[PDB]
């Protein structure tokens, strides 16, 4: 009962901690840098074949193949250099809000309101695309699933939990708790050791995998959260909320650095991504278009308006030569 | 200009065909969306016809297959799982005629109906509206007029008056009455009356849609 007081004192102590380490005001550091310039992009390729909304996408480690998931009960694989279709996989639950392409290129994975991240094998004799596993254990709705190897996946569910698994068996090898609301995102690190999450409780969390326990908490928003990604150096990340704002957090100072807003924007973010050099942040809004930002000056440097509806998904590739956007108008795009 | 990248195109020229053939076949399996007050009538409204997270359903009628994605049992926010239902063909709404006194209930259902019939994703989305548990409403007013829950009402505390009053009080919350329509019915099946009403309403909505997919408005 009375223990609710030590909580407030410890909160004040943590505030003083992550405040005393603040004397920079990052925007006040780059006063002398030359800006990017101005960035126009051209829709090199366009990808059709979906008959309804698409809810996510993921590229491959070769920069050339990608994957999409839609509401027509379809998971399609694309060769983005020729707009050709390699595979079209039919689904069982058309309430889909996730997808993934494994690094090895062998497997993929989906997930939705069925509370199951079905996992598919692409390279099998018998010439077909069979479903290898169906992984249950949740009581919510999968909002993101991301691989680590060909035998270790990570899921995040709306029941305020996340989970690490093991395929050949099917049993949760780890569970991650500490949320007070719906989790709606995920992001793994380049060293595939410690991931990160961000939930509708206006809070994000920096976890660990081996151990199992949270490591840091992050606040600073005024509303829920809908997207998150890292910064190449596995030493920062970026959150996108429905309050029209996108923010950059660091992991060594435990605080936010820059806030990305503009009074003429009211709509809500859905997806976020970085660039191979971490010098340009992409953001997908609900105003039927997208945006672009510079991660060191806070000032826009371009726009990618070519969409007749919302922008639900987005993702840069490893090499760097391209970008992508998914939209509720059922047309994928490839800029560059 | 191409050697064996010409058989990687007789593949993407069959995959598309199969996608179409799988997309020109969802139409005849129309998609409804049941709703209801707190455990009011979502039980038998599903089993009107007798042929894992969110509930599916399937019942057939004159070469028309209805799928009723009951969603009144998913414990999350009213929003983050609702825009997954846009494009749906219609909506249903099952309310009780006499349970208003429990806890009132009529008020909650009215608040729900207002939150629904003016949602951002349900402007052009039509509605059906059933009124179940009627044979009992003939008694509740017989002894307890609805002025308990509508003191501003004064008239014959009887079926053919009070019931019509509630019907015309529910059929008039739509802030726009030209775009979308709103139907009405009662649950006296004869084992097959209501589902016929759904058939009629759904074919009418299909028409009102095609008559915009062909510019004929």
């Amino acid at each position, epitope marked *: 009962d009375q223990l609710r007081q030590e909580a407030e004192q410890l909160k004040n102590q943590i505030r003083d901690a992550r405040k005393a380490c603040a004397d920079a005001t990052l925007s006040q550091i780059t006063n002398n840098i030359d800006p990017v310039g101005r960035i126009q992009m051209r829709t090199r390729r366009t990808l059709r074949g979906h008959l309804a909304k698409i809810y996510a996408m993921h590229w491959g480690t070769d920069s*050339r*193949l990608l994957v999409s998931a839609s509401q027509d009960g379809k998971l399609i694989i694309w*060769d983005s250099y020729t707009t*050709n279709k*390699v595979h079209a996989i039919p689904l069982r639950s058309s309430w889909v809000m996730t997808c993934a392409y494994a690094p090895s*290129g062998n497997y993929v994975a989906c997930g939705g309101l069925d509370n199951i991240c079905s996992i598919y094998n692409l*390279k099998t*004799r*018998e*010439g*077909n695309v069979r479903v290898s596993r169906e992984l249950a254990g949740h009581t919510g709705y999968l909002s993101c699933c991301r691989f680590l190897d060909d035998n270790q996946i990570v899921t995040s569910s709306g029941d305020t939990t996340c989970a690490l698994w093991d395929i050949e068996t099917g049993q949760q090898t780890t569970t991650f708790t500490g949320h007070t609301g719906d989790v709606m995102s995920l992001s793994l690190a380049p060293d595939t050791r410690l991931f990160v999450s961000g939930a509708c409780d206006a809070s994000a969390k920096l976890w660990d995998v081996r151990e199992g326990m949270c490591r840091q908490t992050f606040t600073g928003h005024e509303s829920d959260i809908n997207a998150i990604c890292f910064f190449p150096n596995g030493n920062a990340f970026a959150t996108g909320s429905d309050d029209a704002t996108c923010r950059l957090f660091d992991l060594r100072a435990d605080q936010e650095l820059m806030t990305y807003s503009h009074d003429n924007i009211i709509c809500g973010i859905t997806s976020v991504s970085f660039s191979k050099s971490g010098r340009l942040l992409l953001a997908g809004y609900d105003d039927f278009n997208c945006n672009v930002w510079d991660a060191l000056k806070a000032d826009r440097a371009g726009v990618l308006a070519g969409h007749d509806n919302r922008v639900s998904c987005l993702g840069v590739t490893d090499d760097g030569m391209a970008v992508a956007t998914g939209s509720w108008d059922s047309f994928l795009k490839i800029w560059n | 200009l191409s*050697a*064996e*990248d010409k*058989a*990687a195109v*007789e*593949r993407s020229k*069959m995959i598309d065909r199969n996608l179409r053939e799988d997309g020109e076949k969802a139409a005849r399996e129309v998609k409804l969306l049941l709703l209801g007050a707190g455990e009011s009538g979502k039980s038998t409204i599903v089993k009107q016809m007798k042929i894992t997270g969110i509930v599916e359903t399937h019942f057939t009628f004159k070469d028309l297959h209805f799928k009723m994605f009951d969603v009144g049992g998913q414990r999350s926010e009213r929003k983050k799982w609702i825009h997954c239902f846009e494009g749906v063909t219609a909506i249903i709404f099952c309310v009780a005629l006499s349970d208003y006194d429990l806890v009132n209930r009529m008020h909650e259902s009215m608040k729900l109906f207002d939150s629904i019939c003016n949602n951002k994703w349900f402007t052009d989305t039509s509605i059906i509206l059933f009124l179940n548990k009627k044979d009992l409403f003939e008694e509740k007013i017989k002894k307890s007029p609805l002025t308990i829950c509508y003191p501003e009402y004064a008239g014959s505390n009887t079926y053919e008056e009070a019931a019509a009053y509630i019907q015309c009080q529910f059929e008039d919350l739509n802030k726009r009455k030209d775009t979308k329509e709103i139907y009405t019915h009662f649950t006296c099946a004869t084992d097959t009356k209501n589902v016929q009403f759904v058939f009629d309403a759904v074919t009418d909505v299909i028409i009102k849609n095609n008559l915009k997919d062909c510019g004929l408005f």
Partner: single-chain antibody
Amino acid sequence: VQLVESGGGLVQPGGSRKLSCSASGFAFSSFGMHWVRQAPEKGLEWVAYISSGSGTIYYADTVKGRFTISRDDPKNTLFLQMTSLRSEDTAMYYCVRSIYYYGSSPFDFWGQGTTLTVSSSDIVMTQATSSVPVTPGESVSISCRSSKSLLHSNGNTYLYWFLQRPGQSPQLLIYRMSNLASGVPDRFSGSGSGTAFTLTISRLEAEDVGVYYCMQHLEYPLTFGAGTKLEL
């Protein structure tokens, strides 16, 4: 997997004959199919190609008119029909597989084939050697040379390396001059460019002795070497 062939036998010249393939264990409808041929003591010759959907058919300049390929996807069965036979058509025929898409592995399962006997501008690939003595532990490098550049401008190298042990049927080893199949070890490899192609083994061992072959899929028709035997 299985791919059986039937129909072979002994006919009189001028007659006609049918040959049937029966598959068991894969999505037939999603796979191209060929009919490679081999004579008693010579190399391999290509004869046809049907595709997925049946809307594509090729043939060899030697056979157009009298050989008719056909396919029945439901019952997973292929067909070849022969009219106006001769003695140059005495040979063993092999049912085969082929799937094409980015990341594929054509000629990844050969059948066992039937036998047919009777009474009495194309690229060329030069397979000179016809015998090489060896002893285990020996590391060898076989040669294949072409009459044109195989590399298409899209960055690839449309050459293939095969193998065939005695009393057996072939078994892919390499596809596209660099890439390695699934079901073989890291002992094999290959490399080169533009009419120069070298195979590479390390730590030889029995079950490798036979007749390696060569092939190109840059443009139809398809042409083979003539047999680089490898004995002890």
